[PDB]
From TrEMBL, chain A:
Protein name: Polysulphide reductase, NrfD
Keyword entries, A-Z: Cell membrane, Membrane, Transmembrane, Transmembrane helix
Entry's family note: Belongs to the NrfD family.
GO cellular component term of the entry, any: plasma membrane
Topology term for the membrane: Multi-pass membrane protein
Predominant subcellular localization, coarse grouping: membrane
Organism: Flavobacterium johnsoniae (strain ATCC 17061 / DSM 2064 / JCM 8514 / BCRC 14874 / CCUG 350202 / NBRC 14942 / NCIMB 11054 / UW101) (Cytophaga johnsonae)
Residue ranges that the Swiss-Prot or TrEMBL entry lists as coiled coil: none
UniProt-listed PANTHER family: POLYSULPHIDE REDUCTASE NRFD, PTHR43044
UniProtKB/TrEMBL annotation, chain B:
Species per Swiss-Prot/TrEMBL record: Flavobacterium johnsoniae (strain ATCC 17061 / DSM 2064 / JCM 8514 / BCRC 14874 / CCUG 350202 / NBRC 14942 / NCIMB 11054 / UW101)
Record's keyword terms, sorted: Membrane, Transmembrane, Transmembrane helix
PANTHER family in alphabetical order: PTHR43044, QUINOL:CYTOCHROME C OXIDOREDUCTASE QUINONE-BINDING SUBUNIT 2
Lineage, uppermost ranks: Bacteria, Pseudomonadati, Bacteroidota, Flavobacteriia, Flavobacteriales
Bilayer-crossing regions: 12-28, 47-68, 89-117, 137-158, 186-204, 216-239, 259-279, 299-317, 324-343, 363-381
This protein's name: Quinol:cytochrome C oxidoreductase
Automatic annotation (TrEMBL), chain C:
Keyword line: Membrane, Transmembrane, Transmembrane helix
InterPro entries: ActD
Presence of keyword Transmembrane helix: yes
Official protein name in the record: Quinol:cytochrome c oxidoreductase membrane protein
Transmembrane segments annotated in the record for this chain: 52-76, 96-119
Length: 457, 402, 172
């Protein structure tokens, strides 16, 4: 054909068509081990305890939280936007990499989708839990009623957020689900038990793979990828405008709509990378997730990290350039004040972590990159925390200046969402086809350590 | 090689004469008039400034893309690199002219910038402005010149060695120049991002020392990067129609068409978010920026939205149309005009305000630099063969289809 | 009482050769079944282009009419109250605050209405009976089926030439 000799193989082990399907189907076709049950139990307990904390604070009062009369938001919306940021990784991997014809994405796409459907859901709890009277939440929708057709306004970003999140999730759900049709077909055709036979004959639709069916299938995925990238940007931007549209010094800005997005990409891939690292060893799919996939994840993280760095110095320049004392003081408060440790630990992580990737000896290391990928998520949690808290406890009228400290029920709810995340993801890995077969089988001949060697001789 | 048309020479000469003459013409024509007369005297000056910065950044919009395509190891771009190299020959000449203009401001031959005027910093003067004086640690003139100067070297050096090493790679039995350029381009892109942010502050936001905004430079970047892409496409269409390109087909055109489409939408995104975040919570300080634009430059302000969004929105969405030469040429022209207007809109209200118009001194500067640009680019194409030699990705690009 | 020839292959290379030969020899192909996308099959078969993209664009246009008629009714023509200093006099005035919703609605309808169009035209739903003529085809083996007119002997001898891994003649 015409492939360049420069490129390295994406498939290792001289694997054929049966080799690939057997490898991927194997974890679905067998039983879970003791270690799986131990981990599962732990995640479940954390989740159930978290539910108890949620019920308690809903039924007894928000005053059980560490919120103040000054600081109305902290840890509730902090964790909301943190989970939202995480849930943009999969929609980049399956849509953006698609649009740029990035072949290596084929071994990631499926698990990347799991990362958004199990994290957007976590975020969806906070918009309800923090509410003062959540049983009246249905009033948010513009539904004809007995109050003289009393409506809602359409000027608040909190309402815009309702539309952004509910449609973001809805669209992504049908997108990744459609991609499962040819993979469930390969499981219903195993039918080792009549129970499983029934299950996969129902999970799959009548997907008898045919010329016409595949033709349409490809076109649908192209359209949805085209629509998905705009959603990735617009949804996180609507979230961003909860602070950008304010009158509060330190929040009012124009940099947030692209800034928070860059951060979302950065933190999302850092999360994904840690799960792929443990996945390729537990599931034994290291022949599909190679060091080239890991290296490329590291490179992207490096790139977006530098974008964030530029935005940090942009804000500081403008603050100095501006003659507004209130904006300058807000930045002085972050540099030196009672929350200095949140600010400086945040900056330490975001500034230096992505810069280690310039060194090949560090970038090409599953050990080093595993550690760094974890660190990034810590720094990004503080990124969200610092912006919200440091800008509220200090503002107009010195008499209103205060502090802030969270309680065990603020912490507990967050722990609960983490536990739930892992319950869902862990169960996913034992029932779903973790690697798309329809995708891999279109690249097995184009790339791999067999065919390339053939081309070279 | 590339045989010069033997007609474009005289064509570009005509543009460089009629435009030049029009420029010359433009400079031959209580406290109320102290305002008005400065607005009138600035008209033929900002008419040149906007033309130079437009074409200067136009060239930079190609080099940014060039560096990206090599770093990203594109498998369809190699066949078009010679054209891109030919286009980015303007920069080492256009940047000279632009720099000279900056010097002329420094030597007080105009009133283009406010903070470069006399008596602004000192408190012993009727021209004293405390707000501007407080920003003098950044606006200090000799710092502004040096800071501007080194940005030009940081772009011109890259251009020079990129070409030099490429030609060396064409005449070698191993690699070493490919990898050399790979490393250089990566370094360039890092530098570029930093110099881009500062550049916008110094050359565009410096027209209004009483106004600031975050997300300005990224907006500016998009406003020229998009136009850079369309200029690439238009040159390759021309050369192809004249029989000078081989291994070029509608899939290469299509790929560029959809590329420029997506990034033109991105420009619109940035435009709106900047506007709305001021409009939504109109804290009066920093709001007059839009007040004086909406009330005066009504059609320019909103027309720039339509031409850079609405028009291509209903054109470059049909994949069959993306392969048609006249569809692509048409859209390219509209986009270029739209971004010219974008720069016009950003600069004009700060120099002439309500005395603005699009007559002789504006048209003349456009045509002058148009002719200059054409002359340099097509001359450059005769100094090197199209379709580079041994290159690690050229064999697949010669068979590229989509 | 029609019979169908089931030509079972091994790779895309032999499919492309086989399909092109049936086109040259004028053997009407009834269906082609594959475990994964070929990226040259519909071209060789001569299948007509899809129109799903043409289906959505229109769905997006429906979405924008919904978003704008909703908000222009409620906010300025039913209760034109003041919420802040926002001018609710017209729809030009206070337009920017409606953009975040209008955008999301056009994508929402463009996406979901064409996905269900795909399922309706491809006949896919949760309790639909699967139509695999040979179980092995999903994991592996490619299948081209051609109906028998009357000359079973030569129709089979044709399929016994290129890519003849397994050839079956099955009634109905």
């Amino acid at each position: 054909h015409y492939e360049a000799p420069i490129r390295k193989p994406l498939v290792i082990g001289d694997k054929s068509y049966h080799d690939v399907t057997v490898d991927v189907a194997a974890p679905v076709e067998g039983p879970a081990n003791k270690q799986w049950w131990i981990v599962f139990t732990i995640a479940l307990v954390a989740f159930l305890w978290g539910l108890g904390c949620i019920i308690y604070t809903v039924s007894t009062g928000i005053g059980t939280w560490g919120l103040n009369k000054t600081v109305g938001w902290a840890w509730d919306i902090t964790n909301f936007v943190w989970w939202v940021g995480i849930g943009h990784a999969g929609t980049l991997i399956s849509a953006v990499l698609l649009l740029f014809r990035q072949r290596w994405r084929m071994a990631i796409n499926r698990s990347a989708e799991a990362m958004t459907i199990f994290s957007v859901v976590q975020a969806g709890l906070f918009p309800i839990i923090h509410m003062g009277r959540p049983w009246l939440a249905y009033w948010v929708l513009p539904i004809p009623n007995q109050f003289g057709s009393l409506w809602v306004n359409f000027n608040s970003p909190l309402l815009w957020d309702v539309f952004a999140i509910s449609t973001y999730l809805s669209v992504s759900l049908v997108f990744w689900w459609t991609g499962l049709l040819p993979d469930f077909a390969m499981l219903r055709d195993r039918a080792i038990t009549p129970f499983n036979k029934r299950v996969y004959s129902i999970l799959s639709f009548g997907w008898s793979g045919r010329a016409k069916d595949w033709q349409r299938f490809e076109e649908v995925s192209l359209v949805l990828a085209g629509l998905a990238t705009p959603l990735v940007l617009s949804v996180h931007t609507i979230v961003s405008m909860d602070f950008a549209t304010s009158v509060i010094p330190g929040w009012h800005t124009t940099i947030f709509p692209p800034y928070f997005v860059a951060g979302a990409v950065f933190s999302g891939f850092a999360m994904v990378n840690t799960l792929l690292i443990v996945m390729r060893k537990v599931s034994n799919l290291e022949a599909y997730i190679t060091l080239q996939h890991i290296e490329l994840m590291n490179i992207i993280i490096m790139i977006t990290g530098s974008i964030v760095g530029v935005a940090y110095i942009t804000e500081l320049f403008v603050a100095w350039y501006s003659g507004v004392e209130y904006e300058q003081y807000a930045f002085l408060n972050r540099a030196t004040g009672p929350y200095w440790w949140a600010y400086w630990s945040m900056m330490t992580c975001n500034v230096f972590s992505p810069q280690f990737m310039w060194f090949k000896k560090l970038r090409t290391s599953i050990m080093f990159s595993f550690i760094i990928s974890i660190v990034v998520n810590i720094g990004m949690w503080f990124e969200r925390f610092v912006i919200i808290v440091t800008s509220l406890h200090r503002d107009y009228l010195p008499s209103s200046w205060t502090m802030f400290s969270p309680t065990f029920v603020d912490i507990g709810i967050f722990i609960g969402t983490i536990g739930f995340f892992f319950v869902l993801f862990l169960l996913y890995s034992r029932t779903f086809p973790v690697i798309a077969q329809a995708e891999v089988k279109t690249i097995l001949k184009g790339t791999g350590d067999n065919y390339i060697r053939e081309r070279a001789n | 090689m590339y045989t010069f048309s033997s007609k474009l020479k005289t064509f570009s000469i005509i543009l460089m004469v009629l435009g030049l003459l029009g420029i010359g013409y433009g400079f031959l024509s209580t406290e109320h008039l102290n305002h008005v007369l400065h607005q009138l005297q600035n008209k033929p000056w900002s008419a040149l400034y906007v033309a130079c910065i437009f074409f200067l950044l136009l060239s930079m919009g190609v080099l940014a893309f060039y560096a990206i395509q090599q770093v990203a190891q594109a498998g369809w771009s190699p066949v078009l690199f010679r054209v891109m190299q030919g286009i980015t020959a303007y920069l080492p000449a256009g940047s000279i002219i632009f720099f000279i203009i900056l010097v002329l401001c420094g030597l007080h031959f105009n009133h283009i910038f406010v903070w470069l005027g006399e008596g602004v910093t000192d408190p012993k003067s009727p021209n004293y402005d405390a707000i501007i004086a407080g920003k003098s640690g950044y606006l200090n003139f000799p710092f502004w010149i040096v800071r501007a100067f080194i940005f030009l070297l940081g772009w011109n050096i890259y251009r020079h060695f990129s070409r030099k090493n490429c030609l060396a790679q064409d005449e070698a039995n191993d690699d070493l120049y490919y990898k050399k350029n790979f490393k250089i381009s990566a370094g360039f892109l890092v530098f570029f991002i930093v110099s881009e942010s500062i550049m916008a502050w110094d050359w565009i936001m410096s027209f209004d020392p009483h106004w600031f905004s975050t997300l300005f430079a990224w907006y500016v970047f998009a406003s020229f990067f998009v136009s850079g892409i369309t200029s690439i496409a238009l040159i390759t269409i021309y050369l192809k129609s004249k029989g000078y390109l081989e291994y070029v087909n509608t899939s290469h055109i299509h790929d560029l068409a959809k590329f420029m489409f997506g990034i033109s939408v991105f420009w619109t995104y940035l435009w709106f978010s900047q506007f709305m975040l001021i409009w939504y919570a109109n804290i009066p300080e920093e709001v007059t920026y839009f007040v004086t634009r909406i009330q005066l430059y009504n059609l320019p302000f909103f027309g720039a939205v339509v031409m850079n969004f609405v028009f291509p929105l209903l054109i470059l969405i049909n994949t069959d149309f993306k392969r048609l030469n006249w569809v692509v040429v048409m859209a390219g022209i509209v986009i270029l005009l739209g971004h010219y207007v974008d720069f016009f809109n950003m600069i004009m209200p700060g120099t002439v305000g309500d005395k603005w118009f699009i007559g002789v001194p504006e048209i003349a500067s456009i045509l002058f630099f148009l002719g200059l640009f054409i002359f340099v680019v097509f001359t450059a194409l005769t100094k090197s063969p199209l379709l580079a030699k041994r290159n690690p990705f050229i064999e697949e690009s010669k068979h590229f289809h989509y | 009482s029609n019979k169908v020839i089931y030509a079972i292959y091994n790779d895309d290379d032999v499919l492309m050769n086989a399909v092109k030969k049936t086109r040259a020899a004028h053997h009407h192909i009834e269906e082609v079944f594959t475990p994964f996308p070929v990226h040259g099959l519909d071209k060789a078969m001569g299948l007509a282009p899809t129109r799903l993209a043409i289906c959505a664009f229109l769905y997006g246009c429906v979405g924008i009419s919904v978003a704008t008629t909703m908000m222009s009714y409620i906010m300025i023509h039913d209760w034109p109250q003041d919420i802040g200093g926002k001018p609710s006099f017209s729809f030009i005035q206070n337009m920017p605050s409606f953009v975040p919703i209008m955008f999301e609605m056009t994508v929402f309808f463009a996406a979901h209405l064409m996905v269900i169009t795909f399922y309706m035209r491809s006949r896919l739903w949760p309790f639909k009976q699967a139509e695999n003529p040979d179980v092995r085809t999903t994991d592996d083996h490619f299948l081209i089926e051609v109906a028998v007119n009357d000359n079973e002997a030569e129709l089979v001898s044709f399929f016994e030439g290129t890519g003849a891994v397994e050839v079956k003649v099955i009634e109905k």
